[PDB]
């Protein structure tokens, strides 16, 4: 199948999401504004990151199907 690397960059980008996310929710119940703010700050890099990851994986894998099919 096409796009291995990228499949595997969009799991692992997954999970740094939802530990982030974990972090995040924690930061609020411990009412701690600063690390709100740092948590926060990374999770949307990572979440606009992903975002782009699986649009490109898309691309990709329509693209090998409608080659192979």
Known sequence: GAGAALRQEIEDKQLMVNNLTDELQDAIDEANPAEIANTSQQLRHARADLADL????????????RINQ
């Open 54 to 65: 699986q649009r490109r994986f898309a691309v990709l894998r329509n693209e090998d199907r």
